[PDB]
Amino acid sequence: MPFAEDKTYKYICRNFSNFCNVKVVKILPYLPCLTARDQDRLRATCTLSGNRDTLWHLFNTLQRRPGWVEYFIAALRGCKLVDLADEVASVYQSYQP
Amino acid sequence: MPFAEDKTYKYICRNFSNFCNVKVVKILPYLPCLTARDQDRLRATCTLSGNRDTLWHLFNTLQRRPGWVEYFIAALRGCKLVDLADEVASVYQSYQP
Amino acid sequence: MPFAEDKTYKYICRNFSNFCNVKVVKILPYLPCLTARDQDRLRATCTLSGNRDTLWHLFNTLQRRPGWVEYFIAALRGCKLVDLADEVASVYQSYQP
Amino acid sequence: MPFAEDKTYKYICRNFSNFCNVKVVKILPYLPCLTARDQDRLRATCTLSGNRDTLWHLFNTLQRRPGWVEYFIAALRGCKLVDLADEVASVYQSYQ
Amino acid sequence: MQIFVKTLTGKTITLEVEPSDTIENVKAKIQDKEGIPPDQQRLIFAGKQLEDGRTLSDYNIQKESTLHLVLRL
Amino acid sequence: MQIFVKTLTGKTITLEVEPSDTIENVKAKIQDKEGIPPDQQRLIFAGKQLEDGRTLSDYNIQKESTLHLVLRL
Amino acid sequence: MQIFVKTLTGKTITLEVEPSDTIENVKAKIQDKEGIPPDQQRLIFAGKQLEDGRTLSDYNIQKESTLHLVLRL
Amino acid sequence: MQIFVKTLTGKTITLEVEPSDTIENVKAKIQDKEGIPPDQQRLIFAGKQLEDGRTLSDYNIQKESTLHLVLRL
Amino acid sequence: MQIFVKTLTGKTITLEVEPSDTIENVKAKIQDKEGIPPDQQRLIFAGKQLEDGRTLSDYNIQKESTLHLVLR
Amino acid sequence: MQIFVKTLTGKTITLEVEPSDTIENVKAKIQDKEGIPPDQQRLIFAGKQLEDGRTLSDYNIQKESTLHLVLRL
Amino acid sequence: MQIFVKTLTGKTITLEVEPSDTIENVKAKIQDKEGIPPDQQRLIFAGKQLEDGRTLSDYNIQKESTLHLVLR
Amino acid sequence: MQIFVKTLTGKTITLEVEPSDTIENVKAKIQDKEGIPPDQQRLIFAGKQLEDGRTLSDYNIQKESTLHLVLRLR
Amino acid sequence: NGYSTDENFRYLISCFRARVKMYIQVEPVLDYLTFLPAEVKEQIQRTVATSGNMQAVELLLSTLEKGVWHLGWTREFVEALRRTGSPLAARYMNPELTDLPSPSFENAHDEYLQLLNLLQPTLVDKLLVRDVLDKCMEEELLTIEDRNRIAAAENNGNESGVRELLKRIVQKENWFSAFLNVLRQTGNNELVQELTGS
Amino acid sequence: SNGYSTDENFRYLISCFRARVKMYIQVEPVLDYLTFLPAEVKEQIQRTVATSGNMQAVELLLSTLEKGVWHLGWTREFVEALRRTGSPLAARYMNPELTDLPSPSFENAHDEYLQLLNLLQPTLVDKLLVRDVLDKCMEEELLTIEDRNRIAAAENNGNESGVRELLKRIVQKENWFSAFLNVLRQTGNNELVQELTGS
Amino acid sequence: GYSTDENFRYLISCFRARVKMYIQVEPVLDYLTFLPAEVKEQIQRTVATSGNMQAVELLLSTLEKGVWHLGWTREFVEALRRTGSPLAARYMNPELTDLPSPSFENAHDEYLQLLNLLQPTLVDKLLVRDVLDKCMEEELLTIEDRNRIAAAENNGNESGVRELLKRIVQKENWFSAFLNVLRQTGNNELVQELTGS
Amino acid sequence: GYSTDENFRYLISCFRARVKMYIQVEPVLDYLTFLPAEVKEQIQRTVATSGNMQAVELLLSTLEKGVWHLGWTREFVEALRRTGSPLAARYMNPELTDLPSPSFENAHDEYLQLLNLLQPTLVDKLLVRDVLDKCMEEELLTIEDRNRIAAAENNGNESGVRELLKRIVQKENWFSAFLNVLRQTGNNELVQELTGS
């Protein structure tokens, strides 16, 4: 689904303060959609410049990976961020054709 | 078999939430395949950033050493943690030529 | 007080080797003014490159935060460095209008 | 002696595998030549990324400091690590 | 000492100010010289909203140095 | 399905292969088409050595995908 | 062997030395040619101080290698 | 003073005005020459809309200036 | 051996000296032809102030060279 | 309404469309004079593919705009 | 369409054709006046080879257009 | 086939060599025209040295291709 | 109305030529311009890297003025500006003049830009583009093209990042009011009072 | 093999395919192997690259070769310059021998594949990421060792400047499209190939 | 005896070689308001494509050619004074009062040549990590300059020192203060090699 | 011609492609004292704005034209020899004694093509922090390079090996030395892939 997953990422950018609680190094293992290169570049950035300076890179690297949304919600509620997961999902499943 | 092992690492990345049981400090003695330099990085990371964050470093480091799956499984059930070990094996022997 | 705060920061720079005893990880909890992102970024630099390579980053980030001197002094003497906190005060209100 | 010290670092870089035994956290108190700032850097690097990934940072930071070989040899044999300590001296004193 | 008060429109006003004069006095000099009310000015020198309480010598405004006068609403 | 084997000399050789074939099969016919025996050959795809006994589809090689041939020594 | 001793002013001095010659002896050679005492001489080769008691071959000066001579009081 | 007003059709309008005139004077006086209702105009100078109320000298309109006229249609 | 010490006023100066001359020589020749006391000028050659003691050859002043003169 | 679509060889063609038409409607009407089948047309506007199911107004195209028609590979 | 195709030698060839006419129409009529076999020619319009099947209007070959005829 | 070799002096030497002939053969022809001993030469073809043993076709030197000749001097 | 569409646009860049080069970011807009031959899109890409953005936009508008392109290019150019992250220029370019900002808005935002030029040394000192970027996309006065460009211009120092940010925002729609909003949402509340003067 | 000389034949080809090879020639690295070019000429060409971009300099380069006498064997010096500077496609249009040049269908097809990127460049410039498509691109061998340096340098001022300048490099390589679609496929950009092809 | 624009333009002519060496032009452009924004962009690009010293030459050229609003000369000097290049402010000052003594200008030309000679020693035996914090305390580096030295050091220590050595040489009394910085840190081996004692 | 300046200049035209590939220009500029301070700063900027090889061609072009103090060509060679690019020092040397044998230049060219083919295997299966310590023992990396690699490794091990492999290939006899690094480390499988045996 190349157009709904694009819209929900557009949603994440405009509603980005909601995702400040996501801890990158506690969520990267639960994102199989990221290639082993990306999981190593994000961790390097997280180690170098804190966490919340990486969240934008993490989401901007997820939105390339195909079918990333379904993984992201599974990662969010795997990280006990259930309330945020249900809200990002709502943007997704609602917009499905 | 440097490809069947590589596929096995992709299995662990996807099913990562299963492997959070294994504790790095209690598995590191049973991995001879880890070099004395890489053991130091893991024991330092485990001491610094908890255990769960280190599991991704152990696997990402482990998947580079040759014939790691054979040692990993032998070590992985060396922690009395057999129910999770034999699965990495069912991924392995059910994929050999 | 946009100006007395400005010069007080320059005193901190011009007399910077006096502040080498300030431990960053032991002072960040005492600085509410620091934004949740900067606390995350300073703690990453402190971990990555020691403490006294972070002190200048802590002060260079504080001076942008609103009303930092009042928070800095209260933090600084709350960190048992009373002999250094009153030195900053002895600059601040000794340069107020 | 800005040259015999200079070669001796090239000796240590060349024969670096022998120096893996040196534990940085247990040698830093024996190296007063290292300034307070570098001790904080090395300890943080040793904490962040293990031991043997810090050794090369330790020596590359020692060799800036003045009269380090005289200290390093004493530190090296002060850490009960003598087989290598006499090697470093035998490279340094031999080339005065 | 001469200083120049350059509004955003473009016109430049020359001011005969003394270095010990505080900013409010300079803003007061803007009053009679131009006609802008004392509160409506915002004197900007070398990129620094000039605080009202301080003096020119505090900001180290030398001879014929130019002030950008910006307005409020 | 057509695949290429770009030897370092630049000799680009077209091979017709089915995805289910083993690598030996590609190694076998590349001898028959050009001439190096397999034991001096080392297929390179996606910058990754290709196992002998594996099938093409296991490496997710598609049509028109170009392998590389290097000479074992 | 020919070496070039380039003064800070730009003037180039040519010397005939051997790789076993001491820096002290070299400094004497410049002292002979235009009178700067060896105490006031400070040769720099390859952006590196030339220690006084060591021979050229220690720093690997070959034919037509250039030394920079900077004078300090 | 005279001013030149360009037009979409290219028929440049030359005008005879003075700086203290308001744009209401300029905009209306085109109507008596060109018939475009004062509201219909939307006049441009140097890539900057001119407000109806203010005067030409506000925008530094000088002799033989080149205004631009843009209509809604 | 000719030099041109340009003046802020814009008029150049034709001074005939030789590299043997020191700056007090050329300053004196400036003192003569223009009337500025030597202490009140300061010759400048390509952004390199001329020390009073030295000579024009020390600064590689050559034929038809252009200096610069600043008052005060 | 009056929209342009430019074939990849350059012979642009004018179309009499309505904003809320589904892309099939515009795609179906090339054949009515030109003849490419709907599956072959891959309309591109402003660097974005045009998925046939949605409508023209979905992708925010105004009148006299241009569409790039590239054949399906 | 009257076109100016220029060969290696530099001499131009005028050709009265129509945009409906395809390239073989151009190539075959060169045989009638030049003799170089149709396989030998290959015409280039602004660095683009002329596929034989397609017609001149496909390549925007308009009146007084220059074609390059490279032999061999 | 017919190749040119460019010397430091600038003048370029034409050679009537066949693609089969090795670099030894082409270097011997240099000596037969100028006299530089074959060891002293180091033929260079477009930023690439030429092995003494390989033939020209290995380096893909077709007709009218240019070569560079550099001489070990002291 | 009453005239063509090409000449409507050709007029409308001869009027606002000075107004739009402040607003057009020409490095990304060239991707959406397909009528331009590649040997002209390359020159403009070079003028960006040689003489800066404001010179290339002059070259782009100059090269659009002289020379004729295939019909329908005007909508492709406006649609380029609208979705390349420079919508303020697209209000001016739009040959239907319905959307152009009111003169009071244009005057006010001409003052704010002038004010930001005076206070750039303050911003360049007190701003920290590390903590403002992630709030700029939320307010959508920056684009991933711009946010990549800024973050890659802060690699050679923070202030090079801020000098780049203060070029990108001043082209966005209603930037000053939203920029102050970003500076308030972030910790940089002290800048606002030093910037809005209250 | 041939029916004429070898110098006028090449002057003709750069007079015929000037508009063609202008695309495929990277004039910055090709200048290294043009030894017959005087250094003052190469400076002028070199300055044009930095001023008016690549395709303008190639026009200048092909202009200065066309008008001007050169040492014998410059044609093969020029053609060999193109082959080993990594753009052999231009060499096919410069061999005075004809069988090297691509079939008219191939040249035509790669005009559309070129126009297909220009239409879809904004889509690529967003979704593409040079940090990962670059390395797999060299393995596919359609980016020279010198291009990657200039790609990675254009990556310094942003990712999208890398992509805007990768898509300018790869369109000059022989059979780049079908080779590019691979480079997308063995990377994560499986979405692009759908947008770039319509499968 | 003249106006200020007249002699300040003259001081550019007299000292164009000097202040080309002492002006850090990337940060001075912020304070130069009189320059049109389409020229501050061209200079900012000349910094990023043709080095700083070529951009300063462009900046001095573009100031001296056009005519700017009255009092511009003081913005330029005050820009240089507080952008972290005070030594250039001494020359550019139309007052011509703080201009360094000719012996001082000579002495720091020899030191600068010496530093260029000894640069591979510094780049090899100097850590910008442990010398930066002692520079601001000595006020020979502005927060502008540390921010770009610490950012050019991110791609390696050595590249950090190349950047540090290009911004200390423009500061005032740098060599005496630089040695005081090297002495104060641990790098007492460098000073024994830089001053030759 | 016979002049060693003309002799060097001609030798560049012969090898201009090979040596653009082998010269790491960023550290060389420290040792090139004779170059004007302005040019060196423009070459540093050309590195960042248009890549290394465009800076080397800028360095070589500005070295060729412009008469320098006699014996510069050996100062330039000695710069390349001790800034971790000794392979270019082999070519630059006009007396031409130390030119790598044509078999070497051939063999160590297909090796370079071999890495570009197998770069993804290396990068996936080689981590720099594991190899850097041993890579310095073999002395195919200088402290300049290890700092740059370890600093480039800061933004990801994936980019670290992008930089280690970019740097060893300029070192003399690198491939046979690189394998000795790999086989002396735990990477006994990578050496199997590079050489097959």
One-letter-per-residue 3-state SS of chain C: CCCHHHHHHHHHHHCCHHHHHCCHHHCHHHCCCCCHHHHHHHHHHHHHCCCCCCHHHHHHHHCCCCCHHHHHHHHHHHCCCHHHHHHHHHHHCCCCC
Question: Token pair of P179, please?
Answer: 């394998």
Residue type, A64: R
Quick check: N11 and N66 in contact, CB under 8 A? yes
Could you give the CA distance from residue N113 to residue N121 in angstroms, rounded to a whole number? Answer: 12
* Method used to obtain the model: cryo-EM
Could you give the CA distance from residue P89 to residue J2 in angstroms, rounded to a whole number? Answer: 68
Q: Does N116 touch chain J (CB under 8 A)?
A: yes
- M37 with M119, same domain: the answer is no
- Shortest CA gap J73–chain N (Å): 6
Residue type, N141: E
Tally of helices (H runs) and strands (E runs) in chain J: 1, 5
Could you give the CA distance from residue P119 to residue P130 in angstroms, rounded to a whole number? Answer: 17
Could you give the CA distance from residue I65 to residue O91 in angstroms, rounded to a whole number? Answer: 22
CB contact under 8 A, N188 and A2: no
Tally of helices (H runs) and strands (E runs) in chain K: 1, 5
The dihedrals phi and psi of M115, each to the nearest 5 degrees, come to -65, -40
CB contact under 8 A, A52 and M138: no
Chain M residues within an 8 Å CB radius of C66: 187, 189-190
Could you give the CA distance from residue E55 to residue G47 in angstroms, rounded to a whole number? Answer: 51
Chain B residues within an 8 Å CB radius of D51: 40, 44
**Cβ atoms within 10 Å of G49's Cβ, excluding its own:** 19
With CA atoms as reference, report the closest residue to F13 among F29, F34, F42.
F34
P96 sits in the region (left: phi over 0; alpha: psi -120 to 50; else beta) called left
Given 3-state DSSP classes, what are the helix, strand and coil percentages for chain E, each rounded to the nearest 5? 20, 35, 45
Establish if N98 belongs to a structural domain.
Answer: no
Interface test with A, best of B8, B17, B41 (most A CBs within 10 A): B17
Quick check: N158 and M148 in contact, CB under 8 A? yes
With CA atoms as reference, report the closest residue to O31 among O67, O72, O86.
O72
Domain with residue J67: its CATH number is 3.10.20.90
Could you give the CA distance from residue M15 to residue D46 in angstroms, rounded to a whole number? Answer: 65
Could you give the CA distance from residue P61 to residue C89 in angstroms, rounded to a whole number? Answer: 60
D37 → chain O, closest CA residue:
O130
Q: Is there an interface between L and O (3+ Cβ pairs < 8 A)?
A: no
Chain P residues within an 8 Å CB radius of L45: none
* Other chains touching A, judged by 3 or more CB pairs under 8 Å: B, C, M, N, P
- M180 with M108, same domain: the answer is yes
Quick check: P188 and P102 in contact, CB under 8 A? no
DSSP state, residue N101: S
Chain N residues within an 8 Å CB radius of J46: 122
CB contact under 8 A, J47 and N123: yes
CB contact under 8 A, J66 and M5: no
> What are the angstrom distances between the C-alpha of K13 and each of D32, K71, P77?
92, 14, 60
| Exposure string for K30-60, b = 16+ CB within 10 A, e = fewer | beeeeeeeeebbbbbbbbbbbbbeebbbbbe
Could you give the CA distance from residue N186 to residue P124 in angstroms, rounded to a whole number? Answer: 14
Quick check: G49 and O121 in contact, CB under 8 A? yes
CB contact under 8 A, F44 and P118: yes
Could you give the CA distance from residue O118 to residue O156 in angstroms, rounded to a whole number? Answer: 19
Total domains in chain G come to: 1
Q: Does B97 touch chain F (CB under 8 A)?
A: yes
With CA atoms as reference, report the closest residue to C76 among C57, C97, C55, C48.
C55
Residues of P (137-196) whose Cβ lies below 8 Å from D: 137, 139, 143, 146
- Shortest CA gap D41–chain C (Å): 5
Residues of N (45-74) whose Cβ lies below 8 Å from M: 50-56, 59
Size of interface D-G (CB pairs under 8 A): 5
Total domains in chain M come to: 2
Could you give the CA distance from residue K30 to residue M63 in angstroms, rounded to a whole number? Answer: 41
CB-based burial of residue M104 (10 Å sphere; 0-12 exposed, 13-18 middle, 19+ buried)?
A: exposed
β-strands L3-6, L12-15 pairing: antiparallel
Could you give the CA distance from residue F26 to residue F18 in angstroms, rounded to a whole number? Answer: 9
Could you give the CA distance from residue L71 to residue M110 in angstroms, rounded to a whole number? Answer: 69
Give the structural domain span for M23: 5-93
Q: Is there an interface between J and D (3+ Cβ pairs < 8 A)?
A: no
Give the three-state DSSP class for G68: strand
Q: Is there an interface between C and O (3+ Cβ pairs < 8 A)?
A: yes
Question: Token pair of M186, please?
Answer: 């972030």
Quick check: E60 and E19 in contact, CB under 8 A? no
CB contact under 8 A, C17 and O129: no
- M89 with M107, same domain: the answer is no
Give the structural domain span for G48: 2-71
What is the total residue count of chain J?
A: 73
* Other chains touching H, judged by 3 or more CB pairs under 8 Å: M
CB contact under 8 A, B3 and F53: no
Question: Token pair of A91, please?
Answer: 């943007």
The dihedrals phi and psi of I7, each to the nearest 5 degrees, come to -110, 150
- M60 with M113, same domain: the answer is no
Name residue, tokens 């790598």: P100
- Shortest CA gap A63–chain N (Å): 9
Could you give the CA distance from residue N23 to residue N115 in angstroms, rounded to a whole number? Answer: 13
- Shortest CA gap O48–chain E (Å): 24
CA-based end-to-end distance of chain N:
45
DSSP state, residue G54: S
Alpha helices in O23-93 (DSSP H): 25-28, 37-50, 52-65, 72-82, 86-92
**Cβ atoms within 10 Å of D65's Cβ, excluding its own:** 21
Going J60 to J63 to J64 to J69, the CA torsion angle's sign is positive
CB contact under 8 A, E54 and C97: yes
Given 3-state DSSP classes, what are the helix, strand and coil percentages for chain F, each rounded to the nearest 5? 25, 35, 40
Rg (CA), chain A: 12
Structural domain ending residue among the three candidates N62, N93, N124: N93
Question: Token pair of M35, please?
Answer: 């009528």
Could you give the CA distance from residue N53 to residue M39 in angstroms, rounded to a whole number? Answer: 8
Name residue, tokens 């020409």: M26
Q: Does C3 touch chain E (CB under 8 A)?
A: yes
Any residues with CB less than 8 A from the CB of J24 and at least 6 apart, and which? J38, J52, J53
Interface test with N, best of P14, P23, P57 (most N CBs within 10 A): P57
Could you give the CA distance from residue B37 to residue J12 in angstroms, rounded to a whole number? Answer: 66
Question: Token pair of M3, please?
Answer: 């005239």
- P53 with P136, same domain: the answer is no
Which of N39, N84, N152 has the CB atom closest to P51's CB atom?
Answer: N152
Establish if P27 belongs to a structural domain.
Answer: yes
Quick check: F49 and F26 in contact, CB under 8 A? no
Quick check: E17 and E56 in contact, CB under 8 A? yes
Could you give the CA distance from residue M79 to residue M81 in angstroms, rounded to a whole number? Answer: 6
- Shortest CA gap G21–chain P (Å): 20
Question: Token pair of N115, please?
Answer: 């126009």
Residue type, H58: D
Structural domain ending residue among the three candidates M50, M74, M93: M93
Chain K residues within an 8 Å CB radius of N13: 70
CB contact under 8 A, P61 and N84: no
Q: Does P95 touch chain G (CB under 8 A)?
A: no
DSSP, residue by residue, P102-147: HHHHHHHHHHHHHHHHHHHHHHHH--HHHHHHHHHHTTSS-HHHHH
Domain with residue N40: its CATH number is 1.10.533.10
Residues of O (28-47) whose Cβ lies below 8 Å from M: 30-31, 33, 37-38, 41-42, 44-45
CB-based burial of residue L74 (10 Å sphere; 0-12 exposed, 13-18 middle, 19+ buried)?
A: exposed
Nominal resolution in Å?
3.2
Q: Is there an interface between M and I (3+ Cβ pairs < 8 A)?
A: no
Give the three-state DSSP class for D63: coil
Which of O26, O30, O45 has the CB atom closest to M49's CB atom?
Answer: O45
- Shortest CA gap G45–chain O (Å): 8
Question: Token pair of D43, please?
Answer: 């300890």
Residue type, P185: T
Quick check: O174 and O168 in contact, CB under 8 A? yes
With CA atoms as reference, report the closest residue to D53 among P157, P109, G30.
P157
Chain C residues within an 8 Å CB radius of O143: 13, 60
Residue type, J32: D
Could you give the CA distance from residue N62 to residue N54 in angstroms, rounded to a whole number? Answer: 12
Interface test with O, best of P30, P83, P153, P154 (most O CBs within 10 A): P30
- O38 with O74, same domain: the answer is yes
Give the three-state DSSP class for M12: helix
The dihedrals phi and psi of E16, each to the nearest 5 degrees, come to -90, 90
β-strands J2-7, J12-16 pairing: antiparallel
Structural domain ending residue among the three candidates P67, P92, P117: P92
Quick check: P61 and N41 in contact, CB under 8 A? no
With CA atoms as reference, report the closest residue to N58 among N76, N34, N35.
N34
Rg (CA), chain N: 18
Inter-axis angle of helices O102-117 and O174-184, to 10 degrees? 50
Interface test with D, best of C47, C49, C52 (most D CBs within 10 A): C52
